[PDB]
């Protein structure tokens, strides 16, 4: 009936993690990006971000009602207590999860990995990203497995800025030969407001406000008609 605040916070985190994994393993094909659980007085509203929304709701909201019902009967909420929505994501091109799923479903049919990886990289760059790198490791026929990597732009690896400037996605692709793991890293651009990128700039980047052209006479003289 009651548990301590440490246990409560840990349980909330576990609930978020398991919910995220559940609707990752269900509808990875539906362009699902991530979940966000919102607190509301005596309520738990859930927002799902996906690139494709007609396919997560489906016809007559079938998929939504089914998976809402199973989340209800799973996570111990009272009868009719869970209501999740499905809204599009404003940043589809530079979300790591979405691009990882895009690559995994470009590769699941059976296709050349270089063309798909370059297409994903080009699409992320044309989405305004500051830089990307895609690593695909696994079997390419033979007695040995190789890892080929596609980079373009500029990217950071160390320090704290990598926590809020780079988003990473690691996904497994199951082929008949075996499993190849893909890794999509996107370096978000700096943008105040809009939630497209982090608010703070790179801590090693110093800005100066730029003056304008000044070609003026020696002394100001008033002019009247």
């Amino acid at each position: 009936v009651q548990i301590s605040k440490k246990r409560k916070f840990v349980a909330d985190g576990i609930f978020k993690a398991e919910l995220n994994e559940f609707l990752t393993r269900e509808l990875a094909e539906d362009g699902y990006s991530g979940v966000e659980v919102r607190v509301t007085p005596t309520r738990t509203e859930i927002i799902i971000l996906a690139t494709r929304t007609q396919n997560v709701l489906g016809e007559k909201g079938r998929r939504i009602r089914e998976l809402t019902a199973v989340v209800q009967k799973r996570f111990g909420f009272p009868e009719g207590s869970v209501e999740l929505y499905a809204e599009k994501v404003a940043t589809r091109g530079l979300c790591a999860i979405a691009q990882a799923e895009s690559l995994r479903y470009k590769l699941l049919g059976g296709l050349a990995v270089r063309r798909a990886c370059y297409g994903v990289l080009r699409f992320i760059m044309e989405s305004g990203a500051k830089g990307c790198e895609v690593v695909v490791s696994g079997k390419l026929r033979g007695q040995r497995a190789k890892s080929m990597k596609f980079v373009d732009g500029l990217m950071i690896h160390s320090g704290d800025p990598v926590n809020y400037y780079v988003d990473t996605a690691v996904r497994h692709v199951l082929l008949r030969q075996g499993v190849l793991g893909i890794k999509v890293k996107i370096m978000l651009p700096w943008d105040p407001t809009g939630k497209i990128g982090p608010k703070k700039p790179l801590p090693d980047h110093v800005s100066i406000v730029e003056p304008k052209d000044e070609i003026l006479p020696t002394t100001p003289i008033s002019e009247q008609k």
């Binding site: 050349a112 270089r114 063309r115 390419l140 026929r141 033979g142 080929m148």
Partner: peptide
């Protein structure tokens, strides 16, 4: 099967010669 990818991967294996031939077919009338 990407002829360029096959060349970049295993040009230095038992199949390097045949992979080179498949690459030359994709590029020109080789």
């Amino acid at each position: 099967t990407d002829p360029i990818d096959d060349f970049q991967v295993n040009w230095n294996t038992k199949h390097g010669s045949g992979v080179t031939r498949e690459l030359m077919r994709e590029l020109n009338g080789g």
